[PDB]
Structure 1
Amino acid sequence: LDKGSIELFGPYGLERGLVKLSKNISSLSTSHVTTYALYILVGFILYLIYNNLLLDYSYLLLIIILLLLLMMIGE
């Protein structure tokens, strides 16, 4: 528990996962100006969809959680 599960369901598990999450998100930053341009564009469309379709806010939160899930997984 103390030198075990409490460390993994606690600070140590957070350190492992968040470092992995941080490195996977940073992989998107290729400094390719054409790629950032597409990123701005997809972000633009997502904002347009959320407001135009009067989307359920729960959908947006589910989408964000899903995106963290994917960035949990490498490659």
Structure 2
Amino acid sequence: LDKGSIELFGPYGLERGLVKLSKNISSLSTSHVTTYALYILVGFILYLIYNNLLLDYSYLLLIIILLLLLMMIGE
């Protein structure tokens, strides 16, 4: 427990997960203006969809939380 599940379900688990998460997200940043432009339009469409379909706020968080998990997974 002390040197185990307490640290795996806590500081050492959060350390291992977050570092992998952020390495993946920063693998998006490629200094390619062509790819950045697409990302801005993608982020534009999601804003229009969100605030025009009157989607449930919960629907957004599912997407946001589901995205974070895919960045936790590599390859």
Q: Which runs of 5 or more structure 2 residues have no equivalent in the other structure?
A: none
RMSD between aligned alpha carbons? 0.5
Q: Which runs of 5 or more structure 1 residues have no equivalent in the other structure?
A: none
Residue 54 of structure 1 aligns to a residue whose secondary structure is: coil
Cα deviation, residue 74, structure 1: 1.0
- Mapping of 1:1-75 within 5 angstroms? 1-75=1-75
The runs of 4+ residues in structure 1 deviating greater than 6 Å are none
Identity, % of aligned positions: 100
Query: What whole-Å deviation, never above 9, does each CA across 1:31-57 have from its counterpart, x for those lacking one?
Result: 100000000000000000000100000
Cα deviation, residue 7, structure 1: 0.3
Report the TM-score when normalising by structure 2.
0.98
Structure 2 distance, partners of 1:30, 1:58, is 31
Report the TM-score when normalising by structure 1.
0.98
